[PDB]
Design a protein around this nucleic acid. Structure first.
Length: 578
DNA sequence: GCGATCACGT
DNA sequence: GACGGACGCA
């Protein structure tokens, strides 16, 4: 493009409206370099070196002025990288990444060029073509870098209006401006704050694990003949199914299955199997959680700073990476103790955790208007026990533990939209038997059945389904003549208004909570979101206020035909917040 | 640099 | 045949 390579900041660069590019090339933008800045506004196109621009008091003033509106792509990346430099970014009124995510989350828009292609704009290169792939990644020389950054800013400048126009046609403009963009700032603060980690406690757990892995690893070698890579399903498969001749219950595309569900059925045949299961559990904790956390914890602050991917999933859920903090173990006690290493950032603070109880089935009761399901939540029943009572036609005192377990698994399948092979699998029954359970469910909950039928028809007719706050998911596969592919699209038509509305609700709750915390002059702060749960830390003197405030704000985020209900706990570590 | 397999929470 | 971090091979 035609643009100015500026040696200093000028007044015409600080207009009331601009496309702004604050380029961070490193994937993890925490404390990462800013390699260049581009500004496009009514007066022209400008490239600035960050050493110049970020030391200029008027430019910094302009970045922080809420009344100076900026249009950007992935403003959270820029906001966080600037936070690490002590600079506040305000006034971002349009985020092209989030706009493209809302318009079609299946596109996988991850740079300006991919978003621009959605509106037939191609005068910008993909970041990968400019910087390189993995190891071959590099920042090019200034003339090349400056043209790329100005071309990205020019693209944002030209694309704001067509994206906003389509968002408005879809009734998603408020979803962008009042939900996703405010949430992006809250996520930035959460990531920047980080979670404090007790690294010595993690190290001693790693030491304990490494000893136990060593003991089980040698026991496996004695029970087998040879030594082998227990972590490679191929070598393990030769040992189990050829050397020891265990029955082959399930094959994979490349060989025999050694999944935990197959190994458990093989346990009676040979002592080695239980040890492989034990090794898999321990190795999971060591490699994924202990080693992963120690690798990414910042050694100066002893904090981990995750990155929440706000623009990735087709349901509207967040994801979390580097480290992923949304799948820290909790089901088994050995892994749950890892949560003891997540601690408040200040002495005499505590961890506070609040979770919605059954938000997805409450959402389902609301959208389906199912009388039976609505009444169960209005009575605040144990929904798994109640589902077992209806599915199996027994009174509450005849629900056995196994009945409740199988009803909970049906509830899981309904809440996530898993296939009948999925449900049969984790219930260890036949696909046919799993389908009969679903059948008995629809008979006890005929409103849910009507809703499933109607929403599949709606998806076929409109081409998409929507959530309570107008998030959209397109389902072109709903007319596929491949039965599996079509069934998958049908389940996604059912599931997305459920899981996606629950995502809408907690995102609004986060916005409301952040505003309420400031109103009430609390020091408490949000640290993590885990799909239906919010994790905070606060001075211990604030716990009593948070016990009243947090559940109320989360419960009042939307109004449904059934109440929402939030449980909460607090303690000295994340583990204790139970 | 990839594709494949397994496993964690919600 | 829901979704979203970590051998094999190359």
């Amino acid at each position: 493009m035609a643009f100015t390579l500026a040696d200093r900041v000028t007044e015409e660069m600080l207009a009331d409206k601009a496309a702004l590019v604050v380029e961070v090339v490193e994937e993890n933008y925490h404390d990462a370099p800013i390699v260049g800045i581009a500004v496009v506004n009514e007066h022209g196109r400008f490239f600035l070196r960050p050493e110049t621009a970020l030391a200029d008091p008027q430019f910094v003033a302009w970045l922080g002025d809420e009344t100076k509106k900026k249009s950007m792509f992935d403003s959270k990346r820029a906001a966080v990288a600037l936070k690490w430099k002590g600079i506040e970014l305000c006034g971002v009124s349009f985020d092209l990444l989030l706009a493209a995510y809302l318009l079609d989350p299946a596109q996988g828009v991850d740079d300006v060029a991919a978003a621009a292609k959605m509106k037939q704009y191609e005068a910008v290169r993909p970041d990968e073509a400019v910087y390189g792939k993995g190891a071959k990644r590099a920042v090019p020389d200034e003339p090349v870098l400056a043209e790329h950054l100005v071309r990205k800013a020019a693209a944002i400048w030209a694309l704001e209006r067509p994206f906003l126009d389509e968002l408005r046609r879809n009734e998603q403009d408020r979803l962008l401006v009042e939900l996703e963009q405010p949430l992006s700032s809250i996520l930035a603060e959460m990531e920047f704050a980080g979670v404090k980690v007790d690294t010595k406690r993690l190290e001693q757990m790693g030491e304990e694990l490494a000893e136990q892995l060593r003991t089980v690893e040698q026991r496996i070698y004695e029970l087998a003949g040879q030594e082998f890579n227990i972590n490679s399903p191929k070598q393990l498969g030769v040992i189990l199914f050829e050397k020891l001749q265990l029955p082959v219950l399930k094959k994979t595309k490349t060989g025999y299955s050694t999944s935990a569900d197959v190994l458990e059925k093989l346990a009676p045949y040979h002592e080695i199997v239980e040890n492989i299961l034990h090794y898999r559990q321990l190795g999971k904790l060591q490699s994924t959680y202990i080693e992963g956390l120690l690798k990414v914890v910042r050694p100066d602050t002893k904090k981990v700073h995750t990155i929440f991917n706000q623009a990735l999933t087709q349901t509207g859920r967040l994801s979390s990476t580097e480290p992923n903090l949304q799948n820290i173990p909790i089901r088994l006690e050995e892994g749950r103790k890892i949560r003891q290493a997540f601690v408040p950032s200040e002495s005499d603070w505590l961890i506070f955790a609040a979770d919605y109880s059954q938000i997805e089935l409450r959402v389902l009761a609301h959208i389906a208007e199912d009388d039976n399901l609505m009444e169960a939540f209005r009575r605040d029943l144990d929904i798994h026990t109640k589902t077992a009572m209806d599915i199996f036609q027994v009174s509450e005192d005849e629900v056995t533990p196994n009945m409740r377990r199988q009803a909970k698994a049906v509830n899981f399948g309904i809440v996530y939209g898993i296939s009948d092979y999925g449900l049969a699998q984790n219930l260890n029954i036949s696909r046919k038997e799993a389908a009969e359970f679903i059948e008995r469910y629809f008979e006890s909950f005929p409103g849910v059945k009507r809703y499933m039928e109607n929403i599949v028809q709606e998806a076929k007719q409109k081409g998409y389904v929507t959530t309570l706050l107008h998030r959209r998911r397109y389902l072109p596969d709903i007319t596929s003549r491949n039965f599996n592919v079509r069934s998958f699209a049908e389940r996604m038509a059912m599931n997305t208004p459920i899981q996606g509305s629950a995502a809408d609700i907690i995102k609004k709750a986060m916005i409301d909570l952040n505003a309420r915390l400031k109103e009430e002059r609390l020091q408490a702060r949000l640290l993590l979101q885990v799909h239906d749960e919010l994790i905070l830390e606060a001075p211990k003197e604030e716990m009593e206020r948070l016990c009243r405030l947090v559940p109320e704000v989360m419960e009042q985020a939307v109004t449904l035909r059934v109440p929402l209900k939030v449980d909460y706990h607090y303690g000295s570590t994340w583990y204790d917040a139970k």
